[PDB]
Every structure is written in structure tokens, then in C-alpha cells.
Amino acid sequence: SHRKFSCCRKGNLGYLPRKRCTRGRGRCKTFPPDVQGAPIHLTAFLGYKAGCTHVMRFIDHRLHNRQAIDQATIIDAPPMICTAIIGYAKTPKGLRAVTTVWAAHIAEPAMRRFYRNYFHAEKTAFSTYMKKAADGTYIKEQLGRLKQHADVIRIVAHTQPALTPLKQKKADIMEIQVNGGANVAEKVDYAYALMEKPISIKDVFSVGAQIDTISITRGRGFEGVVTRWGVTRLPRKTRRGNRKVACIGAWHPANVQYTVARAGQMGYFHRTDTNKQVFMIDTAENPRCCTTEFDLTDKSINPVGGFVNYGRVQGDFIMIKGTCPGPKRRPVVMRNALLPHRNCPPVQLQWISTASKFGHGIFETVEERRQFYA
């Protein structure tokens, strides 16, 4: 029969299969295009998401010259060291690598990655490589092979977890493209000059641009269609219960279709939010990061109470307007956006929230609490 009244499919078929992500941390799977002739930039950074804030801003779009409060998420970012250079050629088959020159000296956080348990491990990783390199005659010669045969150069870098409050104690290695540059050599030289050296969010991204947060979303376990896809609860008098999709198909096709609503794993799946602006790029060592000329006192990213379910962010922090995928401390990757909103508002922040997210706080800084309570 014709359905009768008309309504749309509940759920996005392109976001199937809904399984816990096999990829441990978000893999970009894409990078902004090279545009040979642009300044040689870098296109990504890894950070552990902190907590949301709510900042006043001055809006100049067309509400012009008015002030609005909007949530911003602090993605704590540690300087991430660079460990290697990967040159992938663009052969018929796809991006195929032409070898990688890992660095001679690699730290414990990144060494921790290869072995599951460090204390009881062979600790043999890169024993021969360190020996064959070190002189650096070999490293250079192989970087030369990348320049001669490669078209896309990506610098593999490791985030130092000790600087973050994360409990991992092992670095999550990542690949960042060095896109831009007149030729492959300039990109290769840019990668060589950043090798075994900290890379900071300040260099990779800028305030006012939009970047895409990629990550793994929060998860709920098995959840029924009502809380997974969104189908309407059946009316109160239903035997076998109301929280379900009443018809899973029609006698033909006999097999149930893939487009039907089915109970499964809600959450913990890879998602890329897009076009989120960078309200603030700063280092928490400075004690006036939240101090604005319309603040008139001293504040910093750490909120009284601490980021709830998070640490201290005693490091560089990127504040991105809007919610990003992931619970606190989930690794959140960031890429230069691929196609941002054509007409966005300019960013001027006139006040940043610092009171305790824990409970309800009416005291922006620690000192005000002891003076108010006397």
C-alpha cells in the first residue's frame, strides 16, 4: 500500500555501519590539497579535549556591533615532537609510500608505542636503525630518495603525553602532511628542519580560520532504536512493549533490508565535525590568557575546580568555537578545514568564563573566593 501520510527515513544511511571504530584514534583519511606555491605550512595537530567554557564575543556580521555568549571547547595541545618523514608517490594504484626515514633519536613516549607492556619488553625496537644512522650519512641519502621519487611528503610526529594530564604514558603517533611549498625538496627540507624538534599548535594553525575536529564519539553500549536511530515509541498499550520499530519490513523483499532500524552499538564511532573556528591559540604558562582589556584583572585557561573529568592543561591550548566530537581526554585530531563557511564572523573575545565547571561557580578566580568568603 502507499504509506499514507509522508515522513522521511529516520537516521543517516551514509553513517552506517554503526560499529565501535576499529581505528584507535581518528585517522584523517584526507588532508587539505597542496596548492604548490603556497607558504609551506603543516596541516594537523593532536590534542586531548579538555572542557567547554562559554565566551562573550563582539559580532560584526549582519546583530552587528552586539555581544553574544557562545560555547568554546579547549582542546589542550602539547608541543608534539616530529619523528619521521614519509614520501608517498601518486602511482596508478593510489598513494603508495617510497620508504620513510625515521629519526635517529626517538624518545621513550614514542618507543613505548611499539611494545604493549614496556617493563617486560624486549626493548629491541630501532636497535639496528639507530646504529646504521647516527652518522647521518645514511639518513640524508634516504631523504634524498624521497625528494627524487615522492610527490606527497608527510611528517610523522609523536605527541608527548607526559606534558598532558592523560594517563596513557605512551605517545600516539600521527602523520601530518607538509603541504604547500614550491617543490618536493622544499617540503622535504621543511620536514628535515623540524625533525627531532617540537612542533607547536601556534605554527600549524591561526586564530579566525576554521578547522575540522576529527575524533571518536562518546558511547552508550547496546541501545534500542528509540535512543539509537530515533523511531517513535508505539502508544502505551502495546504487548511486547512500546520502545521499538513495529514493522521491520514487508513480506517482499523477504529478507530484512539494510535500511531498517536495528538495535546495536550507540556511540564510540569515528566522526569528523567540520568548519569549527579557532577562537584562541595560546600557551597556559602565560597567566593572562583569559585577561582581556574588558576583564581588568588576571585569569588563565585552568578553571577553579579544574577541567571536570580532566587535568590542568599546563600547556598550549587551542579553543575552537562549538562542540567537538569526543568525551574529555579523548584524543582529538584537528585538520585545516577542507572547505570552510564562505561568510563567517570575525573573532574578537571580550570575556572568557573561568568559574568552576564543577557545580555552579560565581567566583572567576581563586583569590576572589577567599576574599568573598573573607
Binding site: 515522513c7 562559554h54 546583530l63 553574544a68 555568549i69
Partner: protein, 132 residues
């Protein structure tokens, strides 16, 4: 007039609201909301500053009863977030009778009136004694 910024849709169809203007009547019952296209089952919902069709109730003035009229809700009980982040919730649900061209039937609007209604409908702004 202008471009509406989304608020919280406080009042669904069947809501009875009080009448701010004198020439209107004590009960004004929502019947439909203007510019409403929704998915199935959604009861058309209106909010402060939208044009909603109202019917004067049995308690109301006999002359204006038994007809469907345009109206804009002035006071909405449900909390809504203005951009500056203030959430303002009015004490009671109420609305004014306006012709679609903005003509309020009553001589004066009585009771504090929402900022959102004033911007969208100009005449309400001139006749509102205590804008909040």
C-alpha cells in the same frame, strides 16, 4: 520585519493564552501558527514574536467570538535563550490581537512585553508600557 532569531517554541496548538490588549478577550486559544511546515505528528508550535491564529473563548467578548484572528504572543512562560545568553522566562502565557498588517485592535497593550515581539512587530513596540 527583520529576520527572526530562533527562541524556544513555548506554546503548541490548543494552548489558551490571556489577552494583553483591551479590545481583545480574556481567552485567546492557539489554532495554528504562520509559516508552519513540519514533519508528521508535530503539533504546530509558536513562540513570542510569531503570528498565531487565535479564537476568542466563551469567557471572551461576545462581539469578537466565533471567528479566527491573527495574533502575536507577547509573554511566553517557557525559558528561551537570547543570543547574549540571558534566559528570560515571563510569569504567564499571554498574547495581543494584531491584523496581519500590524494593527492592534486594542487601545493599549497591558503587562510587560517581550523584546522579541517589539522588534518583529513595530506597532507593539510603540504601545508597550513596560518592555522587558
Amino acid at each position: 520585519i527583520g529576520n527572526k532569531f530562533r527562541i524556544s517554541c513555548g506554546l503548541p496548538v490548543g494552548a489558551v493564552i490571556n489577552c494583553a490588549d483591551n479590545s481583545g478577550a480574556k481567552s485567546l486559544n492557539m489554532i495554528a501558527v504562520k509559516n508552519w511546515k513540519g514533519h508528521l505528528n508535530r503539533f504546530p508550535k509558536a513562540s513570542v514574536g510569531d503570528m498565531v491564529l487565535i479564537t476568542v473563548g466563551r469567557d471572551g467578548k461576545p462581539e469578537l467570538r466565533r471567528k479566527v484572528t491573527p495574533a502575536v504572543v507577547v509573554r511566553q512562560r517557557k525559558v528561551w535563550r537570547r543570543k547574549d545568553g540571558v534566559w528570560i522566562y515571563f510569569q504567564d502565557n499571554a498574547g495581543v490581537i494584531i491584523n496581519p498588517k500590524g494593527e492592534l485592535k486594542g487601545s493599549s497593550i497591558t503587562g510587560p512585553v517581550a523584546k522579541e515581539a517589539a522588534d518583529r512587530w513595530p506597532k507593539i513596540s510603540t504601545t508597550a508600557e513596560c518592555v522587558h
